[PDB]
Design a binder for this molecule. Structure first.
Ligand SMILES: [Cl-]
Length: 365
């Protein structure tokens, strides 16, 4: 009783998809019609979707598609786009936390009589999120953090970690990170110590999984969460570690985790910071040592220390897209039960809750 239309992503280098060929096949089995746009960015090719029974359509064709098709994507639509949104949309819209230009995003849905079901806010009957990317954010963050630390062992300070492509599968990711790590150890480098803030969550678990798989001793991983951070910063353990991975989004006017003063020290060991939570619009950033959101084509940015060894930050805001196939498979799978409830969305609590939130926020405009 439902037509879904998989929108081609346009955010630069975003390789994930909201529906995978496997989830498309499962949906067609439950009676759905599924259109899939031919996406040059997607880690999945159109042959895979055709074999799943998708009808292949051109990139950007959603914007003239019949009003009854549910348009599904992951990330935001072009900043340059300004036309009424007439469809029911399933997407991350990032317009419910007073983000810059949120009113203009909503005034497209309002003008067109469209609906937004925001992926970020889809919840079960116990208030738990139905599908989220945190594990693969941590996993990809750790992968880049280890390659950065490694690079600093094997290369001069006048070179930076090169552009990276998303890995086509986990085996590829692990092969790459492992090779760099083993080459770093072959320079005589001490095996790194890795401090994780938010170790117990999805992101933390992801980071920990990567670090084990690439052969970093677990005795070398300092696992911090609420128990430890509640003490209040700045923490000496951060500059003392080789690598620091943050999984916690915090914006309270509290003491920072570290700062430039603590980092400016010839005795600092810290080489690499991965802020998985990084958001350059954060008014009270607990890691105030960067102003840039780095990207896959330029994944690290120098921390402008005045003492100590070269320090870099990784602040990519779409880390799961470094392992787009696995990240999309797990996310789409977790989302599937709710997706299967779409025929009866006027009564299904998951979708009802989400429609009311859109209503609640449209009233705020
Ligand atoms: Cl193929």
């Amino acid at each position: 009783a439902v037509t879904l239309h998989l929108r081609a992503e346009t955010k630069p280098l975003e390789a994930r998809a909201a529906l995978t060929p496997t989830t498309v096949k499962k949906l067609i089995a439950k009676g759905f019609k599924i259109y899939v746009e031919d996406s040059p960015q997607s880690t999945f090719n159109i042959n895979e979707y055709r074999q799943a029974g998708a009808i292949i359509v051109p990139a950007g064709s959603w914007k003239t598609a019949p009003r009854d098709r549910i348009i599904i994507g992951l990330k935001e639509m072009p900043e340059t786009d300004t036309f009424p949104l007439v469809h029911e949309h399933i997407q991350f819209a990032h317009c419910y936390k007073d983000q810059a230009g949120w009113q203009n995003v909503l005034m497209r849905f309002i003008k067109g009589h469209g609906t937004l079901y925001d992926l970020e806010f889809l919840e079960n009957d116990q208030g738990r999120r139905v599908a989220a990317f945190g594990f693969y954010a941590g996993f990809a963050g750790a992968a880049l953090g280890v390659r950065d630390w490694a690079f600093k062992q094997t290369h001069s300070d006048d070179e930076d970690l090169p552009a990276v492509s998303p890995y086509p599968n986990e085996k590829a990711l692990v092969k790459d990170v492992t090779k760099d790590y083993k080459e770093a150890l072959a320079t005589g480098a001490r095996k790194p110590t890795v401090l994780i803030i938010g170790a117990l969550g999805r992101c933390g678990s992801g980071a920990i999984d990567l670090l084990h798989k690439v052969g970093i001793p677990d005795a070398n991983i300092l696992k911090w969460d609420i128990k430890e951070t509640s003490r209040g910063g700045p923490f000496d353990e951060i500059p003392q570690a080789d690598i620091f991975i943050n999984c916690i989004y915090l914006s309270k006017p509290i003491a920072p985790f570290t700062n430039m003063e603590k980092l400016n020290n010839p005795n600092r060991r810290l080489r690499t910071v991965v802020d998985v939570s990084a958001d350059t619009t954060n008014p009270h950033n607990p890691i105030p040592i960067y102003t840039v959101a780095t990207v896959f084509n330029k994944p690290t940015v120098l921390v402008p220390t005045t003492a100590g060894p070269k320090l870099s930050v990784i602040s990519i805001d779409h880390l799961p897209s470094l392992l787009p196939r696995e990240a999309s498979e797990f996310f789409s799978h977790d989302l599937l039960p709710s997706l299967e409830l779409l025929p009866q969305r006027k009564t299904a609590p998951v979708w009802v809750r989400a429609k009311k939130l859109f209503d609640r926020h449209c009233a705020r405009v």
